[PDB]
């Protein structure tokens, strides 16, 4: 069995970057917070709570570090990680953590005692981690255009679609959404909707984004991207499947970044970390519901 975990490089702004290691009894080591998946649970939810659970701090996750496997009695551990800046909380000793302390990065190298763990942190190390996130979503699930009787531009997400609407909260909120666009297309708007009221923040209607709009002016689009992504905070855009190869194919390349995943199912996200106004970062997250 492949035991599936996820964590982070927790750091702060001690006034310069600190990042958290770990001290656990039972082993006697050093590490970075993470841990098992619980059911129905997807990984970016999980590093946040582990986060929270172990250190006793509250982050936002930013850029994606990649993966790592190691072997365990049991058979293969699987952790993916993230970067997270802490926003609040204080370490408060637990039943698998003692101490907590924080590092400048070259010490904190020394401090972690795996190998998986300091591969994780020259991950870390590479890039900007003082990141703004935009959060590209494909819609959740909405049934056939081919069934559908009426305008096609009504047609509502189906049941499976509103419970991916509902569990994107968790997801984009641990990536620290804070506002909200959607593509001129009820399928889009109710895919953020359960968010929009958890932030009691409204969505911006967006005509440029749909697929008919993108598929005559593409230009026009990606323009208005850069414009959302250049406004204070992290906003999330739910879009179309049309339009969101496009959009991040280009910026891609244009940034000379490489995603580690790819896909493009509904209820997906891209998770794009900008630094000064640079793309860093673009990390696929299948739908809350697949994997
Ligand atoms: N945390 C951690 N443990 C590691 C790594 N490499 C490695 O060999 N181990 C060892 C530490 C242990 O010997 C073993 C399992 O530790 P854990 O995955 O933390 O699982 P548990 O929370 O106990 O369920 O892997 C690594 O990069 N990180
Ligand atoms: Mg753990």
Redesign the pocket.
């Given at each position: 069995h492949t035991?599936r975990?996820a964590?982070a490089v927790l750091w702060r702004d001690a006034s310069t970057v600190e990042v958290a290691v770990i001290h656990?009894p039972?082993?006697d080591?050093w590490?970075?917070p993470?841990?098992?998946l619980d059911q129905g649970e997807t990984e970016p939810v999980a590093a946040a709570r582990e986060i929270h659970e172990e250190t006793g701090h509250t982050a936002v996750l930013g850029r994606r570090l990649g993966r790592?496997t190691?072997?365990?009695?049991?058979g293969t551990?699987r952790?993916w990680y993230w970067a997270a800046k802490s926003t609040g909380g204080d370490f408060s000793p637990n039943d698998?953590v003692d101490k907590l302390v924080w590092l400048p990065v070259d010490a904190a190298m020394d401090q972690?005692?795996?190998?998986?763990?300091?591969?994780?942190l020259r991950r870390f190390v590479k890039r900007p981690v003082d990141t703004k996130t935009v959060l590209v979503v494909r819609h959740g699930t909405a049934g056939r255009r081919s069934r559908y009787k009426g305008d096609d531009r009504k047609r509502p997400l189906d049941k499976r679609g509103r419970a991916q609407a509902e569990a994107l909260v968790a997801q984009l909120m641990a990536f620290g959404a804070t506002t909200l666009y959607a593509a001129d297309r009820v399928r889009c708007h109710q895919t953020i909707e359960p968010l929009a009221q958890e932030l009691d923040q409204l969505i911006h209607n967006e005509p440029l984004l749909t697929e008919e709009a993108y598929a005559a002016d593409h230009k026009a689009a990606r323009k208005r991207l850069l414009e959302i992504a250049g406004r204070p905070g992290n906003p999330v855009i739910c879009t179309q499947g049309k339009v969101i190869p496009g959009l991040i194919e280009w910026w891609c390349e244009r940034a000379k970044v490489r995603p580690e995943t790819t896909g493009n199912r509904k209820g997906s996200t891209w998770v794009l970390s900008l630094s000064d106004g640079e793309l860093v970062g673009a990390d696929y997250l299948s739908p809350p519901d697949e994997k």
């Open positions: 035991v975990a964590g656990r039972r082993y080591d590490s970075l993470k841990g098992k790592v190691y072997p365990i009695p049991q551990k952790v698998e972690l005692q795996y190998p998986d763990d300091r591969k994780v």
